[PDB]
Amino acid sequence: AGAPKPPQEPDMNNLPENPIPQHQAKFVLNTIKAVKRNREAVPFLHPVDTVKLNVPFYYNYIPRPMDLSTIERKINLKAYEDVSQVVDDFNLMVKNCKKFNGEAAGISKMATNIQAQFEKLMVKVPPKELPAGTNVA
Numbered sequence: 001a002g003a004p005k006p007p008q009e010p011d012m013n014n015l016p017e018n019p020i021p022q023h024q025a026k027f028v029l030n031t032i033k034a035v036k037r038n039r040e041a042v043p044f045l046h047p048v049d050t051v052k053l054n055v056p057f058y059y060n061y062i063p064r065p066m067d068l069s070t071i072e073r074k075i076n077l078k079a080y081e082d083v084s085q086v087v088d089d090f091n092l093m094v095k096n097c098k099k100f101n102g103e104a105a106g107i108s109k110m111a112t113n114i115q116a117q118f119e120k121l122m123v124k125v126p127p128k129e130l131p132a133g134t135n136v137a
Helices: 022-036 039-044 068-076 083-101 106-124
Strands: none
Touching: 022 068, 022 083, 022 106, 039 106, 068 083, 083 106
C-alpha cells in the first residue's frame, strides 16, 4: 500500500492518574451510547473498513483515526482527564471524515448530523465537582 492502521487508543501504559469523576464518566458514556443508536452513526461505530470502501491510502491522509467505539473504550479504560477531551475526540472523528470525503459527500452530512446530536446532549453535562452531599471517605 498504503500506510498501515495505527495502533488502537488508548495506550494502557499512559492511563491518567486523575481521570474524570464517575458521575461525569457515566454521562459521557450514556451520551456516546445514545449517539451510537442513531442510524446516521453506522459508518462511525468502528474503524474504517479500508478494504470494503477501497481506500488503501486512508491512513496516509488520516494519521490519527477516531471512532465512537474508541471513544467508548477510552471512557471505560479511564483514559480521559477532562470531558473536553471527549469533545475533542468526537470533533477529530468528524474532522477526519470531512477532510477525507469532503462537504459534498453524504457521509460528511451523517457526521455533521451526529455531531449536532452529540452537541445537543453535551449541553446538560454535569460539572467536574461531585455534587451536594456526596461523601468522601
